[PDB]
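Replying to the earlier thread about multi-chain prediction with a worked example.

Input:
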Amino acid sequence: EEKEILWNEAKAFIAACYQELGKAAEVKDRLADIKSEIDLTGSYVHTKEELEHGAKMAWRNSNRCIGRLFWNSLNVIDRRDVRTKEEVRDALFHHIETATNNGKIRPTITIFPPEEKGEKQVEIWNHQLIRYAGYESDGERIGDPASCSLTAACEELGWRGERTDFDLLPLIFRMKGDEQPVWYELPRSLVIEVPITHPDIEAFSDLELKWYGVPIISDMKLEVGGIHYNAAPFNGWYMGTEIGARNLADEKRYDKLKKVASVIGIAADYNTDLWKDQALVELNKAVLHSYKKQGVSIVDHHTAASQFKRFEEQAEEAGRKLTGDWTWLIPPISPAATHIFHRSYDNSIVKPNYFYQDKPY
Amino acid sequence: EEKEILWNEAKAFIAACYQELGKAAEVKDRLADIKSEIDLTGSYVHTKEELEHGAKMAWRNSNRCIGRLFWNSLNVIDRRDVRTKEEVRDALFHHIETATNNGKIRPTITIFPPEEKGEKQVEIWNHQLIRYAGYESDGERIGDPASCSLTAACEELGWRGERTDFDLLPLIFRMKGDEQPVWYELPRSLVIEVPITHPDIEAFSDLELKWYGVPIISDMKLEVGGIHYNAAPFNGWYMGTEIGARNLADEKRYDKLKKVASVIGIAADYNTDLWKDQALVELNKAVLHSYKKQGVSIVDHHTAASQFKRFEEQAEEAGRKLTGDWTWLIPPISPAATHIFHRSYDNSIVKPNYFYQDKPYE
Ligand code: HEM
Ligand code: HEM
Ligand SMILES: Cc1cc(N)nc(CCc2cc(CCCN)cc(CCc3cc(C)cc(N)n3)c2)c1
Ligand SMILES: Cc1cc(N)nc(CCc2cc(CCCN)cc(CCc3cc(C)cc(N)n3)c2)c1
Ligand SMILES: [Cl-]
Ligand SMILES: [Cl-]
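Result:
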């Protein structure tokens, strides 16, 4: 059964992949090779070309992503050759450096060996490669609450944070055969951070807010033609609202809106003053300004929606069905000012794609 | 079959309704009466109590409505007795006056005779009882674009608008037996309007913006226990964002954000300045300020979401499943600042409820 399931997934993917690459004539022999490889071994190995286009197709099919216009320019790094935790560590370090690119962020994915028997070769515990720790000790909150459980797990393994509001979590991952994961402190030279200032309000720096440059999702599974790459971290650049309207603004995150209202000099007493809405706008203005000033890539939600509109048009021009998740595509501030808000999207799941998987802690 | 379909709907509704009213003992005899009535006449007639609670349940089941906390205080006006266009006209006039209540808006529904054979007794053409006209003639846009087709239909029947940006559409409805609808101009004394000013920026009044006080939805069908009340206008008070973030801000509506940016003194040149977002906040601040200043009921989206949270809790405290449409419940500005954004809702259809129906124009 499993071999047929794998075979059927491979047939679908190879046909689609090679057609898009203008190599439909090569399909027959490739499928013959794969057919024999599956018979002998129970699996098959992607070519570098198949792997690269597969990761790109997966981004293209990611319904929740507003940034998909640039799907075909994804930088795909093949590290299916790694076998040691040192090689994994250095590959992760390298991903951070090359994706950061001194501020001119490159959308990048690093692909580690796939599951074998449903057996993971490498198991990454981080949600993102760069992320702040979070703590809670007797009513006292420090750092990022979303990181509390991973932070506790790290400190169970001998790591200790300084308990600032912005402790960088270590890389943490487990190798096949090991009962426990290893962890490695991030070199600060690798991590670009951006202090948040406001273009017109000098007092904004009193908040001492900052955020990291590059969002590198490291806990999702890439599925390509029946092969499951459970370890394959990927990054783009931020959309401003992610930082200003969610990470720094959410009550269950850094919860900064009341303090923002204070430094921009407005009262936070009455709902009808819309002070939260005003504070959100100035905070998001500050984020965009600060990233731009430091020379770190970022996009505002209006520009991003415009780019996504072109992605929709491009899909139609290429004859491809468009899929999307309206609830994630609309930005968390002024959504109705985007075209996205005013149309609907088919939330069907198309493969190749990126999927959630169970957390190991 | 229809008598069977009707019977089954009535059975379901009467049972639920009477249980909520603490009158479960009366169900048996009531259904017996309904059974005989359906056999003789092909339909049945709601008691005033059933009708009132039915309309309230329908509001309670309205998935897209953030204002449902106050479902049980709905003011239900029974006008199943009307037979003439003069009676309909005066009932509609009366609804406007009593709902407006000199600014302290009362959530109200006026219920007209139901469909018989799927044959409408009264057919209201207005989307809302109070609404601005819209025009388009050789590249020139005037008024509210959403009203263009109804406006054109009205002018087909001998009405003519002044072609301001805020012409009040006439009441327009058709009586059973008439080929064409009749129309009646709204008395201005009945219609409260609110000039939009800003609390801190005196220049805002240069925009000469205004909006009407009361949103009175008049083109939806109320379904209660298999009975179809196709004509049953209902109103609440506005949530500020409806006016400031949609009606006045939408590009396909009054499209005022560029002009707002100008009077509040910010550049509208770069997306990264978030000038649209800033203009939206100040416009919505102005709307809330202006309604409050004039003494016309309004609610901000934060307060409304807080009230809706209590509605969720009340539903759980009772034995009721909730249901909701996430895409409509989230406000169009700062949605993530509300609890609504961070949870999900079952969008199942429960009856009694309010439903869309085909426009007789268009
Ligand atoms: C190039 C810059 C990019 C931008 C600006 C961008 C923008 C976004 C944003 C804003 C979200 C979250 C939407 C929300 O929270 O409502 C998102 C989700 C997502 N993006 Fe992108 N993205 C980018 C690149 C990428 C890349 C390179 C990939 C993978 C190859 C990717 C795959 C995804 C996926 C899988 C999700 C949803 C994850 C989940 O369901 O939890 N994006 N994107
Ligand atoms: C008391 C004040 C009320 C407020 C503040 C309120 C708020 C709202 C808002 C803001 C919407 C639109 C949501 C959006 O555009 O995304 C809405 C939709 C709706 N409301 Fe309410 N509402 C109120 C009273 C009522 C009443 C009295 C009824 C009927 C008995 C009602 C039934 C509905 C229905 C049916 C819709 C959906 C209309 C459609 O699908 O086109 N609401 N409500
Ligand atoms: C409450 C809520 C609502 C919503 N619409 N979206 C979110 C998700 C924010 C989010 C969450 C996850 C993981 C969810 C499961 N643990 C991942 C992301 C990725 C955002 C992202 C990814 C990438 C690759 C680039 C970029 N600019 N942004 C963004 C949360
Ligand atoms: C594009 C768009 C998105 C969205 N979420 N919601 C809308 C609808 C706004 C709207 C539309 C209709 C009619 C839709 C079908 N033509 C009706 C309403 C009712 C608003 C309302 C009703 C009532 C009763 C009270 C109140 N405060 N507000 C509000 C449009
Ligand atoms: Cl993030
Ligand atoms: Cl409206």
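Chain B touches chain A at residues 245-246, 249-250, 252, 257, 271-274, 276-278, 280-281, 284-285, 288-289, 292, 300, 302-303, 326-327, 330, 332-337, 341-342 (CB under 8 Å).

Feel free to reuse this layout for your own posts.
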